[PDB]
């Protein structure tokens, strides 16, 4: 066959059926979605790397990730993001 190629199609498709069970996707739109995921992912990853370099910490942790999303994502979207992410932290710490 062919070597496996990663995509974010199935996860966004679960997100869609959570948010709108009725609708479908175009593949062009899903290409934009994959580009969006990778772009925001690398932006926050670069923030994570630079902030970890700045305070001379050999680890990356979530604390600077709240720092990163609060600096990068503006305002109420960022504070919403803090809300779901920290509660996701609570479920992950409770396993």
């Amino acid at each position: 066959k062919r070597s496996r190629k990663e995509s974010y199609s199935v996860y966004v498709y679960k997100v869609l059926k959570q948010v709108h069970p009725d609708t479908g996707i175009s593949s062009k739109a899903m290409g934009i979605m994959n580009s969006f995921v990778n772009d925001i992912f690398e932006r926050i990853a670069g923030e994570a790397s630079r902030l970890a370099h700045y305070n001379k910490r050999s680890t990356i942790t979530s604390r600077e990730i709240q720092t990163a999303v609060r600096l990068l994502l503006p305002g109420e979207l960022a504070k919403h993001a803090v809300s779901e992410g920290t509660k996701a932290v609570t479920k992950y710490t409770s396993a």
């Binding site: 190629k5 995509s7 062009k28 290409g31 934009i32 994959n34 580009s35 969006f36 990778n38 772009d39």
Partner: protein, 83 residues
């Protein structure tokens, strides 16, 4: 084998359609050649780095992924072709 003039291949009505999508309702006659010039500049700046990306990959066929890298380095990042 070689080509010498295709900047006129971007015709005036295509520029007019772009200007209508730009919201221009009235276009001077002097617009078209200088828009061709700035298009020339922007395409040079992107394709120089694009073929630079390609030649570092030791490829003689370009990839669209490298075009994505060229535009995102230039600050005009594109969605819809990564992957």
């Amino acid at each position: 084998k070689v080509l010498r003039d295709n900047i006129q291949g971007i015709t005036k009505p295509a520029i007019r359609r772009l200007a209508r999508r730009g919201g221009v309702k009235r276009i001077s006659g002097l617009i078209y050649e200088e828009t061709r010039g700035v298009l020339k500049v922007f395409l040079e700046n992107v394709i120089r780095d694009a073929v630079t990306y390609t030649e570092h990959a030791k490829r003689k066929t370009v990839t669209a992924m490298d075009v994505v890298y060229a535009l995102k380095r230039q600050g005009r990042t594109l969605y819809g072709f990564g992957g």
